[PDB]
Every structure is written in C-alpha cells, then in structure tokens.
Design a protein around this ligand. Structure first.
Ligand SMILES: Cc1cc2nc3c(=O)[nH]c(=O)nc-3n(C[C@H](O)[C@H](O)[C@H](O)COP(=O)(O)OP(=O)(O)OC[C@H]3O[C@@H](n4cnc5c(N)ncnc54)[C@H](O)[C@@H]3O)c2cc1C
Length: 296
C-alpha cells in the first residue's frame, strides 16, 4: 500500500549499456554573474521514449573515457520538469545543473566531468540518458495533502517538477487542493532559481501555495544569524511542527547533504520540548512516507 504515486511507474527502461540518445534543445544560464557558481537549465528531446514521473531522476553518461579507456560512470540528476514537460507535450526533459569547479591538492583547477559536459552543451548536441530512476521523491497520491518542500540550490529540481504539475497544468484525474509550501535556500539573490515561475504560481493559487526564500549571504535573523534554510524555517517552527503532527502532511527535502543536519537540530529541540524523541519520531515519519529525503 503506498501513499505515493508509485502505480505504473517506469524504472530503468534505459540502462548504461543501452542508453537513450537525446538531443539538446536549449541550454540557458539561469544564475546572475554575481552568483558563486553557475547553474544552467537545459532541455533535452526524448520523443516520449522516457516515460518519467515527477520526483524521478535520469542518469547522464558524459562523453569520453575514464583514465582506463572505459566510458564514464553515469551521474544522476533529478528531473526539473513535470511529466508533460516545459512544452506540455511529454516529449522533452529538463535538468537544473550547477557547474562544478574545484582545486586539487596541487592548487590546480579541476572541473567536474559531467557537470561541465552538460553546462557546455549546445542545441543539437546528443546526450546519453538512462533511467528513469527512483521512488523516494514521488508525489503523494492525496490531492488535498499538505506538501512541505525544503530545497537548497539544485535541490529545487524535483519541486519545480511537482509544482508545474500542481499549478501550471490541467489534468483529467488530478487537481491539487491542499497546501504546498516551498522553502528555497540559496547564497545570493542572483542564485535564486525559477523565482519568476514561483511568483506566478503564487498569484495563481494564493491560498494553496506558500513561498519562502533564504538568501544566506544577504539576510540575517534578529540575533543577526545568516539566513540559512533552517534559519528561515525556525521562524515558522510552531506552525511546521504542528503540521508534522497531521497524517496528511508530507515532508520532502532535497539538495546538499549538509542541509539534513541543520534541520534535524531545529527539530530535536521542538520535539524534546513536548516530550518526544525526534529520532524515533522521524523514524515513524519515514515509515509512514511522510519524511522524504534526497541529499547529495
Ligand atoms: C539523486 C541525485 C540527484 C542529483 N541531482 C542533481 C541535480 O539536479 N543537479 C546537479 O547539479 N547535481 C545533481 N546531483 C549531483 C550530480 O549527480 C553530480 O555529482 C554533480 O553534477 C557533479 O558531478 P561531476 O561529474 O560534474 O563531477 P565529478 O567529476 O564526479 O567530480 C566529483 C568529485 O569532485 C570532488 N570534489 C567536489 N568538490 C570538491 C572540493 N571543493 N574540493 C575537492 N574535491 C571536490 C569530490 O571528491 C567528487 O567525488 C545529483 C546527485 C544525486 C545522487
């Protein structure tokens, strides 16, 4: 019995040994120049061959071979488009990719393999895709559910997918009528991803959509602390904790591995204040499919 939309999902239709070769339609830089690092939104054509569902991921095999002449390992990316896609025809798939650049031990600049291959793609370029992959981040079946989404950076991807389905499309068997609440934590305002789309959704469903941003390097709370995602959440602590107590509330978290810790710290304190052991409570939530996490 599942509380999530798992029925009839497709998994690994395409594999590393036999990937689907799609073509790049668009590749746009979506962060401003201020932004520490670039993030690109790219759309690939798949001609309806990849029947994915919101919350799933695809694997990308970047071109080239590793140091042993073998093809590169696949990298997973959460799909940033709903099942119908940015064009509404179920024939394209979109990714939100941050270009990874770091320095090794010798002080030499290293560019991450897949992220740079992807961010450098030009319209018309081919790309090997695998998947769909995943069940963890699927949407709840309940159209009247309270859905709380907490993402950092590219972690915004599966929530854009959820929200396009909920607020930008008309479906024959699905009409969202609950409360969706998105918290997006980025470092700078130039790093806010898809803000403009979320602003249009907010105007469209003002009573079904709540929106909060946390721009760490530009905002602080009363004590003067940096506005991290948990720093912005604590401001609604009483309300969120009360929401977690209800059976129709579903929590989803996606983004950088780090975010997990800072949210757990806020929660341990709220629960203890009520005589609840957060570790066991979180365990029960996870079993009930109400606490969903995908960090990397
Ligand atoms: C389920 C899932 C979904 C994902 N969704 C997305 C998504 O939507 N968008 C997205 O951008 N990414 C996403 N990722 C991450 C993505 O899969 C890649 O890991 C990412 O793009 C970097 O891969 P790469 O091939 O560019 O880097 P690689 O060439 O694999 O390099 C990564 C390596 O660089 C090293 N490294 C990184 N930072 C540093 C540093 N500061 N100093 C030293 N060494 C360092 C690490 O050891 C790491 O092993 C997701 C990952 C998972 C598991």
């Amino acid at each position: 019995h599942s509380k999530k939309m798992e029925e009839g999902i497709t998994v690994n239709k395409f594999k590393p040994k036999t990937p689907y070769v799609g073509r790049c339609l668009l590749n746009t830089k979506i962060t401003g120049d201020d932004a520490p690092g670039e993030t690109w939104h790219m759309v690939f054509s798949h001609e309806g061959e990849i029947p994915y569902r919101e919350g799933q991921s695809v694997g990308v095999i970047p071109d080239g071979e590793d140091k042993n002449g073998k093809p590169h390992k696949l990298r997973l990316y959460s799909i940033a488009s709903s099942a119908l896609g940015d064009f509404g025809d179920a024939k394209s798939v979109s990714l939100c990719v941050k270009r990874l650049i770091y320095t090794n031990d010798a002080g030499e600049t290293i560019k991450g393999v897949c992220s740079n291959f992807l961010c450098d793609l030009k319209p018309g370029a081919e790309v090997k895709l695998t998947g769909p992959v995943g069940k963890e981040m699927l949407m709840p079946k309940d159209p009247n559910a309270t859905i709380i989404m907490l993402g950092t950076g590219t972690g915004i991807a599966p929530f854009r997918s959820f929200l396009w389905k909920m607020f930008f499309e008309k479906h024959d068997d699905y009409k969202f009528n609950g409360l969706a609440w998105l918290f997006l934590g980025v470092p700078t305002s130039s790093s806010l991803l898809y803000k403009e789309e979320f602003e249009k959704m907010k105007e469209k469903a003002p009573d079904n959509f709540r929106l909060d941003f946390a721009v760490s390097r530009e905002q602080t709370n009363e004590k003067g602390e940096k506005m991290y995602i948990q720093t912005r959440m604590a401001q609604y602590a009483v309300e969120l904790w009360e929401m977690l107590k209800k059976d129709n509330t579903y929590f989803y978290m996606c983004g950088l591995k780090g975010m997990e810790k800072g949210i757990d710290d806020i929660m341990v304190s709220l629960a203890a204040a009520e005589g609840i052991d957060w570790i066991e409570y979180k365990r029960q939530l996870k079993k009930a499919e109400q606490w969903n996490v995908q960090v990397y």
